[PDB]
Amino acid sequence: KKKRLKKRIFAAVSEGCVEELRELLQDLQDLCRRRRGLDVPDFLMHKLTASDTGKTCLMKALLNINPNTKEIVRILLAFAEENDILDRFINAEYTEEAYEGQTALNIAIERRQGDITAVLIAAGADVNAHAKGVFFNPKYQHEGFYFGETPLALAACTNQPEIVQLLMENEQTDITSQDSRGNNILHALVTVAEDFKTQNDFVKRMYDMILLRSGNWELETMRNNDGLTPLQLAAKMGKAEILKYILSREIKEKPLRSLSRKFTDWAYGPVSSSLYDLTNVDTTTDNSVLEIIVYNTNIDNRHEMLTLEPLHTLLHTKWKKFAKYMFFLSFCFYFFYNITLTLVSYYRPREDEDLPHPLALTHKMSWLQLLGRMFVLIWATCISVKEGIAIFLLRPSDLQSILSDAWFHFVFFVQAVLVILSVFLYLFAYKEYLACLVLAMALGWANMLYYTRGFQSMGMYSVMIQKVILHDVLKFLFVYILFLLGFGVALASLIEKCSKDKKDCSSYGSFSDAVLELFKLTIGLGDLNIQQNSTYPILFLFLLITYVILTFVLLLNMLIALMGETVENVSKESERIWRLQRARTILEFEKMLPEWLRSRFRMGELCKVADEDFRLCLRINEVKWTEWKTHVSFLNEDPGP
Amino acid sequence: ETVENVSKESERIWRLQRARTILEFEKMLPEWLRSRFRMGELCKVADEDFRLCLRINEVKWTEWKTHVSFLNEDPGP
Ligand SMILES: NCCOB(c1ccccc1)c1ccccc1
Numbered sequence: 061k062k063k064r065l066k067k068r069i070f071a072a073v074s075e076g077c078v079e080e081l082r083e084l085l086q087d088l089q090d091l092c093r094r095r096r097g098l099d100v101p102d103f104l105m106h107k108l109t110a111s112d113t114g115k116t117c118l119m120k121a122l123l124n125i126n127p128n129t130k131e132i133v134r135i136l137l138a139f140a141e142e143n144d145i146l147d148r149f150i151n152a153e154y155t156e157e158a159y160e161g162q163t164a165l166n167i168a169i170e171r172r173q174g175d176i177t178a179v180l181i182a183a184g185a186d187v188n189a190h191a192k193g194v195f196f197n198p199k200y201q202h203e204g205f206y207f208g209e210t211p212l213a214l215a216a217c218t219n220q221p222e223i224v225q226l227l228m229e230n231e232q233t234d235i236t237s238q239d240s241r242g243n244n245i246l247h248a249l250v251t252v253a254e255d256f257k258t259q260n261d262f263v264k265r266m267y268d269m270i271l272l273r274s275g276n277w278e279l280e281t282m283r284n285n286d287g288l289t290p291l292q293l294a295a296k297m298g299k300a301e302i303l304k305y306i307l308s309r310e311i312k313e314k315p316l317r318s319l320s321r322k323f324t325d326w327a328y329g330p331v332s333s334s335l336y337d338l339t340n341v342d343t344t345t346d347n348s349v350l351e352i353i354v355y356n357t358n359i360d361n362r363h364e365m366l367t368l369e370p371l372h373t374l375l376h377t378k379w380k381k382f383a384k385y386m387f388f389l390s391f392c393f394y395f396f397y398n399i400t401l402t403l404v405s406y407y408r409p410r411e412d413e414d415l416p417h418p419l420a421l422t423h424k425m426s427w428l429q430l431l432g433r434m435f436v437l438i439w440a441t442c443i444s445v446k447e448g449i450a451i452f453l454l455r456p457s458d459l460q461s462i463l464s465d466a467w468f469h470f471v472f473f474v475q476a477v478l479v480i481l482s483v484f485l486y487l488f489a490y491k492e493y494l495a496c497l498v499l500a501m502a503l504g505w506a507n508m509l510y511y512t513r514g515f516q517s518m519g520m521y522s523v524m525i526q527k528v529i530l531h532d533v534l535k536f537l538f539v540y541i542l543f544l545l546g547f548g549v550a551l552a553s554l555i556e557k558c559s560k561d562k563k564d565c566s567s568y569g570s571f572s573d574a575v576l577e578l579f580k581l582t583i584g585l586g587d588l589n590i591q592q593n594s595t596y597p598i599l600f601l602f603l604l605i606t607y608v609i610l611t612f613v614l615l616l617n618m619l620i621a622l623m624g625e626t627v628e629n630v631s632k633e634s635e636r637i638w639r640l641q642r643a644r645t646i647l648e649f650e651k652m653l654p655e656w657l658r659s660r661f662r663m664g665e666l667c668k669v670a671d672e673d674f675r676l677c678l679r680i681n682e683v684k685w686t687e688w689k690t691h692v693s694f695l696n697e698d699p700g701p
Numbered sequence: 702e703t704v705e706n707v708s709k710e711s712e713r714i715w716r717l718q719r720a721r722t723i724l725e726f727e728k729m730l731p732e733w734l735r736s737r738f739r740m741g742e743l744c745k746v747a748d749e750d751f752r753l754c755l756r757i758n759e760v761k762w763t764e765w766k767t768h769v770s771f772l773n774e775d776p777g778p
């Protein structure tokens with residue numbers, strides 16, 4: 061095409077040079093003179109825009125930047141103004157698939173140029189643009205930076221408060237606008253705002269700024285293409301610090317304190333009562349906040365989120381009024397359950413009826429000695445149906461929570477089924493009649509570890525059991541097998557190859573007996589009679605002493621293996637795992653609670669500002685001392701009769 | 702200092718005692734087909750296109766600056 065005009069400009073634009081560019085303009089003005097069938101638009105947009113990427117001359121002026129860019133934007137605008145093509149020039153996009161809608165306004169906000177940005181808006185740049193390129197990236201950590209693709213959110217995402225102050229004063233700016241993911245702007249701040257504390261933290265300061273700049277309540281009711289409110293999106297993404305704002309959000313004004321989530325009942329000196337607006341927070345709607353915090357597995361800091369005041373005292377009140385008494389009730393049922401399996405099989409009052417059958421319901425039984433056998437058959441089937449529904453529900457949780465929680469759904473289910481399969485085994489009478497019963501009884505007492513939740517230090521001990529058995533027993537066992545099998549070959553010279561003095565007359569297993577008589581020492585159930593040889597018992601015992609010392613050092617380092625911030629981390633994480641593993645039980649009990657008579661918490665519906673008396677459901681607290689202020693909040697009283 | 706030193710030094714001795722294995726395996730790896738890492742040879746400033754071997758990372762947030770560095774894009778097809 062002999063494009064000696066186009067590439068000459070884009071270099072001179074990248075230089076930012078003015079005087080060389082002014083020469084390039086009058087040559088192009090004469091080049092516009094040479095043909096006038098398509099006068100300005102379709103000739104200059106073949107000259108000012110790259111072919112493949114669609115990168116224009118103005119975006120090239122904003123990728124590279126030097127102190128002549130404050131002038132060279134004006135010249136490239138006045139060139140489009142003198143040629144009356146500015147609207148398709150100020151609002152041109154990448155035709156490239158990776159940057160679909162990266163406009164010149166986005167790339168000017170991207171380079172954080174506040175003075176140049178106001179010129180482009182005054183030149184008529186599209187403020188409601190959308191950049192739908194491949195920078196969305198499910199593989200997020202590289203080439204990503206999702207920001208909700210609008211020019212308003214991009215200044216909102218990249219700490220540009222003055223440009224947000226500029227863009228939201230433009231009346232053409234669609235603040236309520238959505239994304240390809242359905243995200244509005246408050247979704248976009250949620251999906252960026254990290255759980256780093258105070259990175260001169262701008263997002264919470266700017267999430268604050270957008271709602272107070274403009275907006276009714278009809279912005280956080282907007283759902284994305286997952287159907288999530290920005291409160292729910294802040295919970296599902298687990299961004300804790302932005303969610304400490306949304307659940308508090310006290311607004312001390314009176315045009316727009318209706319947007320506030322925290323209120324005041326009354327204020328009287330250093331004692332004051334706080335009220336929470338609590339709409340989607342409580343487990344009363346579909347996919348509530350506690351529904352999407354506590355059942356979530358993906359995020360790390362669930363405990364850092366449930367410490368927050370609207371979630372905390374609500375979880376305490378569900379605990380005290382409701383879930384404590386069901387837990388003790390479901391304790392005493394499943395505890396009398398396991399006593400019954402112990403008192404049916406292994407009781408034998410006097411002289412049982414010639415190898416009986418445990419769960420049998422024979423012709424004459426007094427109604428104290430077989431109703432317990434009915435009590436097992438009911439409450440095993442009651443458990444077997446319950447987590448059988450959890451097969452239909454917990455499809456992704458089990459593999460993602462590979463060690464943390466929801467194992468106790470399984471171990472209850474395996475224990476309940478093997479009781480029932482022992483009854484199915486009776487109807488066919490195979491060899492494993494007693495075998496499937498006892499593993500059902502052994503798990504039944506091992507299942508009481510699920511009821512070791514409930515006391516504040518009891519599960520905090522029980523989680524430390526679940527930590528060592530899952531993580532660090534297989535650590536120790538793989539080394540302990542190793543020196544076992546290491547010295548065991550060294551010991552099994554002194555069996556079957558050495559003196560032995562009387563042996564090859566006892567049972568079997570030359571290597572196996574040498575292992576086991578070295579393996580009984582860790583119990584302390586030590587045998588001397590296996591060692592009677594000829595003059596090698598000098599060499600036997602000093603070998604076997606170096607087993608005990610070596611398997612002391614494996615034991616002594618095992619205590620140090622749990623050490624390393626045991627003053628903090630082994631104690632505190634086992635506490636915070638426990639509080640999450642008890643808060644998941646409580647919301648599970650509300651699924652167990654029938655829909656009728658939830659006449660419970662969710663306190664009285666006092667006014668907010670508006671004409672309706674009952675506006676919203678509430679939650680009352682008791683906040684405290686210093687940093688006084690002369691309050692202008694609410695009904696100035698004590699709470700009332 | 703088991704809270705710090707017995708735990709942390711045993712970790713840092715281990716990372717050195719695993720990083721010595723890895724460079725030992727490259728001596729074990731035959732010279733043919735080391736078609737591996739050492740990413741693409743992009744420009745530096747100069748007239749040669751391939752200037753030097755590279756390594757790509759993914760750096761992050763606050764303390765922004767208006768950048769004047771390089772090819773102003775996302776990494777490319
Ligand atoms: N006073 C709070 C009592 O409830 B908390 C609680 C106690 C035991 C089990 C489950 C919850 C609690 C709730 C949220 C954050 C921290 C603790």
Ligand SMILES: NCCOB(c1ccccc1)c1ccccc1
Nearest residue numbers: 386389390391393442443446472
């Ligand atoms: N329909 C199944 C009920 O089983 B319950 C139960 C469910 C899961 C895990 C453990 C027990 C139960 C709950 C409260 C009190 C008593 C029992």
